[PDB]
C-alpha cells in the first residue's frame, strides 16, 4: 500500500478529539457553587492507519490453484477475473457452442495455446491483435 | 484380456496391457476404442509412472500416435507428449502430414500454437525443415519460430498487468544506492514482465550509475525481462549503457546491456542475433563479453545455427574470467535436446583445466541443459563428475541428473545424489543434492516434503537453503499444504 | 563509481591452511603474522599457493613485524625452483582476541590495503578463538566516515554470512562493518587428501600386533570385577531411570555415580579388545604354522 | 468380485475377469505389508537422528 | 457374468496403488542413506565439538560450586568473594 498516504489520515483524525476536549474542559463545574468535578472531563486522542486484509478462502491445500466449484467465461488474451496457476483441465471446460471458435473435439484446450476452427461455425467477429503493431 | 475386450473398457485395457507389455494389446487387440480425449491421455502418464525403462515407453507412445493418425480427428495433446518425452521429430510430423489430405489449414495452426508453449524451444527449429517436405495445408513458419506467437501473448500480459513502481521509489530515494541497488533491480525486473514500465528506467537513469561491482552488471541486465518481446523500446533502453550512444558508464553496464538484449529477442531471434554474433567475435574479453555471450546463445534457440556453438567454445578456451561463466550456460542451450558429445566434452574437460571460480559455476549448470530427456544415459555422466578430484566438479554432476530425468521420476537418479551428500561432510554437495531431488519427484510431488525434511535437520544451515529450493521447484505450478509449512520456520530463522 | 570494492573469497591450498595453523599455534600467546604468497585469478579469487612466517615477537602484527631480510631471502629461493609469485596479502594470529581484527592489526591492514585493494588481513585459528573450528575469515577495515558515503556496503556484498560471538557485541559490530564472515573454500584434489588420511605405513604391522596373552586374560578379569560392583546400584535403578534432570535422578534411581553409564563403558572397552586380540593371534598362527 | 461364489465359464464370460480383480486386490494386500514396515523402519532412524541434530545445532 | 463398466472401477484401485508403491520405493532409497547421513552428522559433530573445546581451555577462572538450582543455569561463587548466576555448558551432571 505504501505508508505516505497513511500518515496524512492519522493527523486529520486527531483534530476532532482536541476540539471537543477544549470546550468541554473549559466549562467550570468546580469553581461554580455546584461541584461535580472538572477531572472527570479527561478525554484522550486517536489516529487512523490501514493495512491489506489477510483471509484464506478456497484453500484445499496452502496454495493449490484455489479450485472454484463454479465457472465463468474468460476472453482470449485476457483474465477478466484473474486465473490461477496450473489447471490444464479446468481451462476450456466445454467450448461454447455459439462462439466463432468451436471444434471437432471438445476440451483440447489447456493454457498451452490452441486455435479452434471457424469451418464448423462462424457467428461472432474475429479480433486479431498482436503487439506486432506496437513494436514496428 | 478377452474378458476385458468383451466389457469394452479402454481404461481397464491399458492397465492389463501394461502388465503384459504388448503394443497391439494397448490399442485393443482388434481396434474398438476410438475415444480420442480422456482415457487415451491417461495411459501415457501410466507408462511413465510405473515403468523406468525408456525403450518400451517410446514404442507405446509412438504406436498410439499412428493408430489415431488414421482417424479423422487426431488429438493435439497426444503428439505434444511424445514430442517432449522421446525428443523424436516423428510424432508431430506424422499427424501434420495426414492433415494435408484433410486441407484443414485451421487444424495445423492449432497444433503449432500448442507446440510452441509445450515443447522444447531448441527442438522446434529442426522440425520445420522436415514438415515442409511432407507438405502442409509455409504459413506454419511464423508460429513455429515463435515470432508471431510471442507478440500475441504480449497483449495478454500487458493489459492485465497491475503492480506499481512505488515500493522501489521509496527505498532508492531515501539512502544511497549500491547494495539497495540489487534489491530494486531484481524485484523491478521480475514484476513488470511483458508490460510497458520503461517509464521508471528512462527518468531514473541516474539510479544505475551509483552502483558498483556485480550489482552494476545486474542493473542494466534486469531491463530485458521487463521489455520481453517488445522490439520497440528494447534497442533504445540498452543504447545508453552500450557504447552505441553516449554515457556507457562502465564495462559492467555495457555487458549488462548486451545480456538484456539477448533476453528480449530470445526464441524468435531475427536481426539481433547477427549484431550480438559480430560483437562476440570482436570483443572476446571479460565483463562486456559475459552478457554478449549469454544473449547470443538465447537468441540462437528457435532458429538454430552451428556458428554460435564454435564461437562460445573458443571464448571459453581463452581464459577470460567473467565471460567464461556465460559461455558454459550458452553451450548447453544451443546443442540442446538431441545430445552432442562435443558439448558434454568441452564443458566437463574445461572445468578441470581452469582454477577460476566464476567459469566453473557456469559450466556446472551448462552440461545439464544439453542432457534433456536422456534419462538413464545421464547416470554415467553424474557418476564421473562426482568421482572427480575437485569439490567443485562434484556439484556439476548434480546438475546433469536434474535436467535429464524430468518428464520421469525414477529410482535410479535419486540414489546417486544422496550418495554424494552423505559421504562428504562438505556444505556445497549436500545443499546441491537436495535441490535436484525435488525436480525428479515432481511427477508425484507429494513425496518431496517427506524426503526434504530429513535433510534440513542437519548441522549445516547450508543444506537448509537447498531444502527450501527443492520444495519450491517441485510445487512451482501447483503445490501442497505440507510444502508451505516446511518452508515457514526457515523464514523466521535469523541465519540470513 | 567504476570502483571494484567487494568481498573476496580466499581459496586456500592444503599446504597453506596446515602451515598457517602451525605458525599460529607455535606463536601463542604472542601475536605472530606472515605473508601470503600466491597468484590472483578471476576477479575475487585470491589464491594462497604458499606462506611463510615473520618471526615470533611481542612486537608483531605491526608494520614493525615485517622484515625486508626475511621476505627477500624467501623470495629468492623460489626463483631457483622457478616459481613466480606476487604478494597477495597477509595472514596473522591473535591469541588474545577472536577471529576479528584488533586495534594493533589496523596499521598493517591499512598499508597492505593501500598497496593492493586485493590484500586482506586473514585471522587464523590459534586456540583463543571461542567460535574456532578453524574458521578463518579475511576482512578489510574501514572507518565510520567512509560508511555513510556508502563505501561500506560494497564490501559486504557477495558472501554468505554466519554469526559469531567469541567476545560479545563490540566484536559483532566490527564484524558486520567489515565484510561479515566471508566464505572460505579449499582447493584440493584426491591425491593430496589420501596422504593426510593415514597416520603411518606401520599400521600394516601394528594392526596385527598383540601384546602377551596373560595381559589379555588380565584385562577380562579386571573389568568383570568392576562390573560386579556396579550391579547392586543397577538393581534399584531399573524401576525408573528414564527421567529427566540428574539432580532429581540422584535420589530416585541412584543418579549419583550413574550405574547405567558405568556398565556401558565397561562393556564397550572389554568387547572390542577381546575380540581383536583373539582374532589377530589366531589368524597369524594359521598363516605361519 | 469376492473370494466366494463359484460360477461356470471363464473364456469371455467375465466373471473370471472380476474374480481376478479380487486377486488383484490380494496383490496390493501383499504390498501394504512391505510398505508399513518401511515407514516404521525409516521412522526408527529419524528418531535417532533428530536426537543427534539437536545436540550439534544447540 | 460381467460386461458392465465395473472393471474400470476395479482397475482404479490397482492403478492408484501402483503409483503410491513407487513413491515408497523413493523412500526405500532414502532409508538406506539416512543411516549414512547419521554417520556424516557425527563427523560434523566431532568437528563442531572443537568449537566448545576452545572456551573449555584457557583463559579460565576457578570458582566453587555452591549448589545447582537447575540444569541450564546455576548458582556459583567464584574465588573473588563474588557470586554469579551462570550457565552450564552442555548440561553437566
Amino acid at each position: 500500500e505504501v505508508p505516505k498516504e497513511k500518515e496524512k489520515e492519522k493527523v486529520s483524525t486527531a483534530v476532532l478529539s482536541i476540539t471537543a476536549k477544549a470546550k468541554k474542559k473549559e466549562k467550570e463545574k468546580e469553581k461554580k457553587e455546584e461541584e461535580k468535578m472538572e477531572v472527570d472531563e479527561a478525554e484522550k486522542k486517536e489516529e487512523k492507519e490501514k493495512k491489506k486484509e489477510p483471509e484464506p478462502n478456497f484453500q484445499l491445500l496452502d496454495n493449490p490453484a484455489r479450485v472454484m466449484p463454479a465457472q465463468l467465461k474468460v476472453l482470449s488474451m485476457t483474465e477478466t477475473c484473474r486465473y490461477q496457476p496450473f489447471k490444464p483441465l479446468s481451462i476450456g471446460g466445454i467450448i461454447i457452442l455459439k462462439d466463432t471458435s468451436e471444434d471437432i473435439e471438445e476440451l483440447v484446450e489447456p493454457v498451452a495455446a490452441h486455435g479452434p476452427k471457424i469451418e464448423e461455425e462462424e457467428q461472432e467477429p474475429e479480433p486479431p491483435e498482436p503487439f506486432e503493431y506496437i513494436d514496428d | 484380456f478377452q474378458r476385458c475386450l468383451d466389457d469394452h473398457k479402454y481404461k481397464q485395457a491399458i492397465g492389463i496391457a501394461l502388465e503384459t507389455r504388448r503394443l497391439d494389446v494397448f490399442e485393443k487387440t482388434i481396434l474398438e476404442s476410438n475415444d480420442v480425449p480422456g482415457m487415451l491421455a491417461y495411459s501415457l502418464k501410466l507408462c511413465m509412472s510405473l515403468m523406468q525403462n525408456k525403450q518400451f515407453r517410446n514404442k507405446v507412445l509412438r504406436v498410439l500416435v499412428k493408430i489415431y493418425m488414421n482417424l479423422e480427428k487426431p488429438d493435439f495433446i497426444n503428439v505434444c507428449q511424445c514430442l517432449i518425452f522421446l525428443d523424436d521429430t516423428q510424432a508431430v510430423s506424422d499427424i501434420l502430414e495426414k492433415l494435408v489430405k484433410e486441407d484443414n489449414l485451421l487444424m495445423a495452426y492449432q497444433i503449432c500454437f500448442d507446440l510452441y508453449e509445450s515443447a522444447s524451444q531448441q527442438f522446434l527449429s529442426s522440425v520445420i525443415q522436415n514438415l515442409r517436405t511432407v507438405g502442409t495445408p509455409l504459413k506454419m513458419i511464423k508460429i513455429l519460430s515463435g515470432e508471431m506467437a510471442i507478440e500475441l501473448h504480449l497483449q495478454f500480459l500487458i493489459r492485465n498487468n497491475n503492480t506499481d513502481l512505488m515500493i522501489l521509489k521509496n527505498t532508492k530515494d531515501a539512502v544511497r544506492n549500491s547494495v539497495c541497488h540489487t534489491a530494486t533491480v531484481i524485484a523491478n525486473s521480475f514484476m513488470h514482465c511483458g508490460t510497458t514500465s520503461d517509464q521508471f528506467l528512462r527518468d531514473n537513469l541516474e539510479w544505475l550509475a551509483r552502483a558498483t561491482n556485480w550489482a552494476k552488471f545486474t542493473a542494466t541486465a534486469s531491463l530485458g525481462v521487463i521489455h520481453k518481446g517488445h522490439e520497440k523500446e528494447a534497442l533504445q533502453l540498452m543504447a545508453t549503457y552500450l557504447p552505441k550512444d553516449t554515457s556507457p558508464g562502465s564495462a559492467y553496464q555495457e555487458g549488462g546491456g548486451l545480456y538484456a538484449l539477448g533476453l528480449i529477442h530470445a526464441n524468435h531471434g531475427g536481426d539481433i542475433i547477427d549484431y550480438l554474433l559480430n560483437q562476440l567475435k570482436n570483443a572476446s574479453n571479460d565483463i562486456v563479453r559475459h552478457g554478449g555471450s549469454l544473449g547470443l546463445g538465447l537468441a540462437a534457440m528457435g532458429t538454430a545455427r552451428q556458428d554460435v556453438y564454435d564461437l562460445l567454445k573458443t571464448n571459453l578456451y581463452q581464459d577470460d574470467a567473467v565471460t567464461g561463466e556465460a559461455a558454459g550456460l550458452a553451450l548447453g542451450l544451443v546443442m540442446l535436446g538431441s545430445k552432442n558429445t562435443q558439448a558434454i566434452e568441452d564443458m566437463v574437460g574445461y572445468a578441470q583445466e581452469t582454477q577460476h571460480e566464476k567459469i566453473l559455476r557456469g559450466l556446472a549448470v551448462g552440461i545439464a541443459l544439453v542432457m534433456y530427456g536422456r534419462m538413464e544415459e545421464a547416470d554415467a555422466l553424474i557418476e564421473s563428475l562426482c568421482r572427480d578430484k575437485d569439490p567443485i566438479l562434484r556439484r556439476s554432476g548434480m546438475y546433469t541428473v536434474a535436467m535429464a530425468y524430468c518428464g520421469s521420476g525414477n529410482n535410479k537418479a535419486i540414489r546417486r545424489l544422496l550418495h554424494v551428500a552423505v559421504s562428504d561432510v562438505n556444505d556445497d554437495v549436500r545443499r546441491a543434492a537436495v535441490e535436484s531431488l525435488g525436480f525428479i519427484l515432481f511427477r508425484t510431488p507429494e513425496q518431496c516434503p517427506s524426503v526434504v525434511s530429513l535433510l534440513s535437520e542437519s548441522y549445516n544451515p547450508h543444506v537448509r537453503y537447498g531444502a527450501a529450493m527443492a520444495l519450491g521447484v517441485c510445487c512451482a505450478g501447483t503445490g501442497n499444504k505440507e510444502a508451505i509449512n516446511l518452508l515457514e520456520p526457515m523464514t523466521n530463522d535469523p541465519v540470513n | 563509481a567504476p570502483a571494484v570494492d567487494t568481498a573476496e573469497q580466499v581459496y586456500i591450498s592444503s599446504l597453506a591452511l596446515l602451515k598457517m595453523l602451525k605458525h599460529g599455534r607455535a606463536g601463542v600467546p604472542m601475536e605472530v603474522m606472515g605473508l601470503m604468497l600466491g597468484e590472483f585469478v578471476d576477479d575475487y579469487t585470491v589464491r594462497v599457493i604458499d606462506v611463510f612466517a615473520m618471526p615470533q615477537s611481542g612486537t608483531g602484527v605491526s608494520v614493525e613485524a615485517v622484515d625486508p631480510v626475511f621476505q627477500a631471502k624467501m623470495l629468492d629461493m623460489l626463483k631457483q625452483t622457478g616459481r613466480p609469485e606476487m604478494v597477495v596479502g597477509w595472514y596473522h594470529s591473535h591469541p588474545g582476541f577472536g577471529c576479528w581484527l584488533s586495534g594493533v592489526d589496523i596499521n598493517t591492514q591499512q598499508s597492505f590495503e593501500a598497496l593492493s585493494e586485493r590484500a586482506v588481513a586473514v585471522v587464523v585459528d590459534p586456540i583463543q578463538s571461542v567460535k574456532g573450528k578453524v574458521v578463518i575469515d579475511a576482512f578489510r577495515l574501514i572507518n565510520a566516515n567512509m560508511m555513510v558515503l556508502g563505501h561500506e556496503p560494497r564490501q559486504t556484498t557477495s558472501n554468505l554470512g554466519h554469526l559469531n560471538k567469541p567476545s560479545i557485541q563490540a566484536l559483532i559490530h566490527g564484524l558486520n562493518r567489515h565484510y561479515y564472515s566471508i566464505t572460505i573454500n579449499y582447493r584440493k584434489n584426491e591425491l593430496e587428501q589420501k596422504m593426510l588420511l593415514n597416520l603411518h605405513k606401520k599400521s600394516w604391522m601394528e594392526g596385527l600386533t598383540l601384546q602377551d596373552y596373560s595381559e589379555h586374560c588380565k584385562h577380562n578379569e579386571s573389568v568383570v570385577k568392576e562390573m560386579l560392583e556396579l550391579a547392586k546400584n543397577y538393581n534399584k535403578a531399573v524401576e525408573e531411570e528414564d527421567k529427566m534432570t540428574p539432580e532429581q535422578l540422584a535420589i530416585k534411581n541412584v543418579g549419583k555415580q550413574d550405574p547405567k553409564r558405568h556398565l556401558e563403558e565397561h562393556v564397550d572397552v572389554l568387547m572390542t579388545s577381546n575380540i581383536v586380540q583373539c582374532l589377530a593371534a589366531m589368524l597369524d598362527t594359521v598363516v605361519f604354522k | 468380485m469376492a473370494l466366494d461364489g463359484p460360477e461356470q465359464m471363464e473364456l469371455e464370460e467375465g466373471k473370471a475377469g472380476s474374480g481376478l480383480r479380487q486377486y488383484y486386490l490380494s496383490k496390493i494386500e501383499e504390498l501394504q505389508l512391505i510398505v508399513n514396515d518401511k515407514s516404521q523402519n525409516l521412522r526408527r532412524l529419524q528418531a535417532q537422528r533428530n536426537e543427534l541434530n539437536a545436540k550439534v545445532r544447540l | 457374468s460381467f460386461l458392465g463398466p465395473e472393471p474400470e472401477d476395479l482397475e482404479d484401485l490397482y492403478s492408484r496403488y501402483k503409483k503410491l508403491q513407487q513413491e515408497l520405493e523413493f523412500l526405500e532409497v532414502q532409508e538406506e542413506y539416512i543411516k549414512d547421513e547419521q554417520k556424516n552428522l557425527k563427523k560434523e559433530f566431532l568437528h563442531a565439538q572443537e568449537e566448545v573445546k576452545r572456551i573449555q581451555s584457557i583463559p579460565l577462572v576457578i570458582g566453587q560450586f555452591l549448589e545447582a538450582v537447575d540444569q541450564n543455569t546455576a548458582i556459583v561463587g567464584s574465588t573473588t568473594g563474588s557470586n554469579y548466576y551462570v550457565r552450564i555448558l552442555s548440561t553437566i551432571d
Side-chain angles (χ1 to χ4, degrees), chain C residues 264-276:
Chain C
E264 200 71 57
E265 285 167 84
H266 294 159
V267 102
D268 194 50
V269 295
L270 185 44
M271 179 50 68
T272 189
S273 293
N274 177 281
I275 297 310
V276 160

Side-chain angles (χ1 to χ4, degrees), chain A residues 64 79 105 113-114 119 129 135, chain B residues 74 104 114 151 160 229 231 478:
Chain A
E79 288 159 8
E105 280 160 286
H114 281 277
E119 270 176 347
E129 175 69 71
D135 284 8
Chain B
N104 307 137
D114 184 29
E151 297 315 327
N160 297 352
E231 307 212 306
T478 186

Side-chain angles (χ1 to χ4, degrees), chain B residues 7 9 11-12 15 19 42 46 49-50 52 409-411 414-415 418-419 421-422 424-425 430 441 444 446-447 454-455 458-460, chain E residues 2-5 7-8 11-12 14-15 18-19 22-30 32-34 36-37 40-41 43-44 48 51:
Chain B
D7 315 299
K9 292 304 306 177
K11 211 295 197 175
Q12 170 70 315
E19 321 282 299
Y42 198 40
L46 187 65
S49 196
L50 178 62
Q52 296 187 21
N410 288 343
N411 210 247
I414 53 180
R415 161 161 285 166
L418 297 170
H419 184 276
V422 307
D424 295 305
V425 301
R430 298 200 56 93
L441 300 175
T444 175
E446 281 73 34
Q447 181 58 19
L454 314 176
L455 282 158
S458 197
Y459 179 62
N460 294 343
Chain E
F2 292 84
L3 57 313
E8 173 161 55
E11 186 53 51
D12 207 2
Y14 192 35
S15 311
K18 286 132 89 190
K19 307 188 176 72
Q22 197 72 78
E23 311 196 74
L24 271 273
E25 286 175 74
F26 307 138
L27 191 71
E28 189 194 286
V29 180
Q30 180 56 230
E32 172 181 8
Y33 280 112
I34 212 182
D36 307 336
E37 271 180 41
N40 189 236
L41 179 73
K43 295 191 184 178
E44 296 164 72
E51 201 185 68

Side-chain angles (χ1 to χ4, degrees), chain A residues 2-4 60-65 76-80 82 85-86 103-119 128-136, chain B residues 36-37 73-77 103-104 106-107 110 113-114 117-118 147-148 151-156 158-160 166-167 169-170 196 229-232 477-481 484-485:
Chain A
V2 187
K4 296 168 174 152
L60 306 55
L61 296 173
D62 280 335
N63 304 288
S76 183
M77 305 193 292
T78 305
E79 288 159 8
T80 69
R82 165 67 59 230
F86 197 83
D103 55 346
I104 78 289
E105 280 160 286
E106 306 312 85
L107 188 65
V108 285
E109 306 194 300
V111 271
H114 281 277
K117 309 180 161 181
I118 54 145
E119 270 176 347
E129 175 69 71
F131 206 63
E132 191 73 74
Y133 316 152
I134 316 198
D135 284 8
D136 300 292
Chain B
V36 197
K73 36 188 184 184
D75 73 304
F76 331 120
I77 308 299
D103 311 278
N104 307 137
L106 339 81
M107 208 184 294
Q110 179 158 17
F113 216 162
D114 184 29
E117 281 193 57
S118 67
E147 172 69 62
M148 192 242 177
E151 297 315 327
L152 286 168
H153 299 324
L154 259 284
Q155 284 287 22
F156 164 50
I158 190 177
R159 296 192 292 237
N160 297 352
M166 299 315 291
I167 302 148
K169 198 65 158 52
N170 202 29
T196 302
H230 288 36
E231 307 212 306
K232 39 155 177 166
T478 186
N480 299 286
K481 196 204 179 320
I484 298 302
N485 59 241

Side-chain angles (χ1 to χ4, degrees), chain B residues 28-88:
Chain B
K28 292 279 215 172
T29 191
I30 175 178
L31 178 69
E32 302 185 344
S33 49
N34 290 278
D35 50 270
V36 197
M39 293 175 227
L40 184 64
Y42 198 40
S43 190
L44 305 173
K45 292 84 164 183
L46 187 65
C47 286
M48 171 217 88
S49 196
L50 178 62
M51 303 187 163
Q52 296 187 21
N53 180 109
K54 209 183 181 73
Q55 297 74 82
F56 197 65
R57 294 178 295 203
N58 290 172
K59 301 171 59 67
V60 173
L61 254 63
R62 273 182 300 198
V63 101
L64 270 47
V65 175
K66 304 200 179 41
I67 201 65
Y68 287 88
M69 176 268 277
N70 300 99
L71 283 79
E72 190 53 30
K73 36 188 184 184
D75 73 304
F76 331 120
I77 308 299
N78 188 21
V79 310
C80 297
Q81 295 162 269
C82 306
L83 183 51
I84 305 158
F85 195 76
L86 288 79
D87 297 271
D88 84 314

Side-chain angles (χ1 to χ4, degrees), chain B residues 382-395:
Chain B
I382 170 172
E383 278 186 326
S384 193
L385 293 160
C386 300
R387 212 63 62 259
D388 232 282
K389 28 185 152 176
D390 316 287
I392 189 56
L393 273 276
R394 315 177 73 74
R395 194 193 294 183

